[PDB]
Amino acid sequence: MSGGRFDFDDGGAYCGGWEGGKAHGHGLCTGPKGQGEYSGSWNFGFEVAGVYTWPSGNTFEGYWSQGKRHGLGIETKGRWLYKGEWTHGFKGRYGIRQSSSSGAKYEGTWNNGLQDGYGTETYADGGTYQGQFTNGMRHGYGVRQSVPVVVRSPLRTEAAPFETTETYMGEWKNDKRSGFGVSERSSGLRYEGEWLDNLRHGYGCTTLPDGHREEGKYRHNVLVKDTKRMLQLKSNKVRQKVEHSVEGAQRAAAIARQKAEIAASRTSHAKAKAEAAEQAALAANQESNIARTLARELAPDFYQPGPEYQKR
Template sequence: WMTGGRFDFDDGGTYCGGWEDGKAHGHGICTGPKGQGEYAGSWSHGFEVAGGYTWPSGNTYQGYWAQGKRHGLGVETKGRWMYRGEWSHGFKGRYGVRQSLSTPARYEGTWSNGLQDGYGVETYGDGGTYQGQWTGGMRHGYGVRQSVPYGMATVIRSPLRTSLAS
């Protein structure tokens, strides 16, 4: 049978929620020592299953977990970047999209051990693209790199000219 309550760890962290056989089980919230991050979601025999983690830096992860690591589908927001896709044993895995929250920069494609690997399309901050093969986070093999069309580049520059002229 399951019980619940609050548990204070020796390191200053706390857990509030369901409990079974001395382990977090069911729904609960765990806060790290000195407020070093918080996980809220479902637990199974001491391990996170599905929920959100927020770090003191403001970085977040919402999604699935296995054996204490991100595993399955999830969304990570880290600084000005967001990754939506699959995770494997704590790393970005198989297929996903990483995009900038402030520029057009993004990568959509396959991943391995947290790095672009296989095939993907990267769009750069200036709108240029690379579509092709990747190995260990680097462009490698066959691919096509396209720069921003000249007309688009002039549109980007024209407001700058106007402000300098006035």
Template sequence: GEFVCNKPMGRGVYTWPDGNSYEGEVYSGIRHGSGTYKCTKNYLSYKGQWYQGERHGKGTVYYNEDKTSWYKGEWMKNNREGWGVRCYPSGNIYSGEWKNNMRHGEGTMKWLKQGQEYVGTWQDGVQHGRGTHVWILRRVDGSQYFQSNHYKGDFVQGQRHGQGTFHYASGAVYEGEWRNNKKHGQGKFTFTDGRVFEGEFVDDQMMTPSLRAPTPLGAFPLSDSDSVLGPDMALNIECLLEKVPERKRDTERKQVEFVVLRQDIQLRSIYSFYSRLGCVCSPDNTFLLSRLQLWRLLKDCNIHHHGITLTQIDHVIRDDASSAEIHSPFTPILLWKLLRCLVITAYHIYNKDMMSQKNLLASCLSKMMTDDILPNAKNVKGFLFRQPDLAVVAMKYVKRCWEVYQAYCRVSTASKDDLTMTCRHLLWMFKDLQLLDHKLTTVKLMDIITAESCDPSNRSSCLDLQITFLEFFEVLLGCAEVKCQQTSEVLEEGRRPLSGCDSEARRDVPEGEASEEMMQTINSPSLSSEDFTAQDVESGDIKTNINETPSSAEHREERSEGNDVQTSVMETKDHKVELRTQAVHQFFNHIFFPAFDHHQLVTRNTEEKLRQDALRHNTLA
């Protein structure tokens, strides 16, 4: 290597008698800078930064020949310190902060074989502080559980200790104190059927057997052994049974359970279908229905056409939920909560029509299942979930749009502790944000708002109706199509196949220039829903049979044409997905959010000016 003043300096290669070697930068004969060290005896190797002969800075170590055990990250004086990723021979992976070769600080550990994951604080190599531990339960479709066991709370020396919440796969929840991995101290245990125990726990055991029902009026439900349903489907309908003579309550409950049992497969399938809407994937194949997806199910089944709004349904199924939770799109809905929602909603819709029936609650549920749920479920409507590719993109904007929705909610006249939005408030918002123009007119906006109402022509009748966040968000997506349509048409024109010399000329345009030109004009809406789907591409009408042997040039030409058709279909589908995606990005990032932020800034400045003027006036007075 290089020498300066008779000293190894610069770049060079060291080779030791035992076969170990170093190649890289050297200062005064010491490894300093960037370089690679290899140990032939135990197959250890390090590539990265050095400081005065020690691993220091960023670098990667492989600890075995197969390179299945490694660390990539920051070093300090030969120790793992800072941020880095460690893959162990077992396949387990830790990514996060390190100190003195130990997991220390914020980090994530995945135990692959055990199916566990911890995200949170570490100290001296073990969980210590706040964190979340998940026991991943790999489930198959149609199985009993829709979530995995997970604990969120305090850890001390690797054990659950302090305050924490444990969510069980069955749907049960414990919130309270822990000691040495056991429920110990004051806590609240919510059973899968909604029953609640609040009191003292000692070594995982309830000390005072006092249960209360989740509703203020009802007694706690029958035990799971008395029910014909499984624990994940145990019904809590005490609020309805209170309306039934006491001698008939057990019979009413049993008959409702029989209706649910007859539709068990369909109900689980519906739950599974809607819980996946807008979701990309789940590591344990578990999907938990959210209130946002529940709203979509109810709208798909036209429940809102029966004289009850989605916000009213939120109220009748609220239990003891806080006012902040009853309209939140993020609230998880377990299977038993969905069933409870359907039973209560069916009663409110059909109780007058079914009054003469022997079993009122069961008759109402059976009628709603037959007339509304089963014929319409899974036929997804609306602007959000109807197009799966667009839904995944749109869901990224839900959290920010929820903040906007809350900013425009007002106190409800029906309930003083309830903040909701009406269609009138929504119109005022579009006016305040100056979003209306020659493309998005007031009439067009009202058409979007009333698209799924039972009487779209009667626009004025819906002005004072309360709307949920789903309805608010889908109006925004509908407006994205309208406001971005012009650019979409320009793009569509540019995408039409060229022929003859035009096609040849197009080939001469460098790919980078073509892409840049395309990106300058992308501002597109969602096109017609009559797109080719993946099923179209895979169908026999388009795909040629690879087992057929062409017997002539004509057959070869037909196959070539078939492949061209398949390629064209895929390109068309990909292009339309791109247009929809760009429309959503353009509307939210360049139109809606900037308009909202500007209006908020102007409002704050105006309020501050008025406050200063009032203070000045009071001072002069």
């Protein structure tokens, strides 16, 4: 009549409202061999708002278009969960990806399904990055707070009466400290100057907690020039080049603080869209139940595999 069942060639069926020869209203539709199940609203052959269940028990709950996850929705997989916006099947623009295991998390913008633009990244150990992203990596300006020796033995401190975190603000290239940047440990140990692939490389100043200033040129983290002296050229004084790089590094740090603040603002937007995505998953589940009940009322022996999936 205006609803029922249809068996596909590759296996898997459709069972629900139809009108004008196309699925319309509500219904279920399994995949080849009856594996994988959509269940929700339809409109002229295309899912509108519904829940897809993989045989693995993984699910997308949200809105659809042209057969792609589009709009808001929640994807629950084994170890990862995404809540927020989807654009033609790709995560983004705004949304959050969270670990089922750890507190590991990304909250920000996405381009082409990868972390990109501005976002807050939290690592399993509780550290964070806030700032710019490109192609799924820390890139541009940003602020990372994390846990950071040659003598392992405590002798040097066990001898006399005796009474952490590190923050890098500066340039990032493909997930690495690279360019100008400032690095500050909670002890007071600090480096301002040039970086390459997370190492001091170029000119900069290492200042010890007591304030002793080591100024010079670093090459893959090893000092190779200092400010003592001899055949130093007037045209190329280490103190000048260090000063320039230090200034370059504080500029980069302040820039990275700004991009950090933008990232924080984009993070709130991603959170807002993640909550909006919970209401989209609630609506998707309302449509799914309408389709589950109509399906039992149009074919009481037709097996719905999604329930069994999600138990496993």
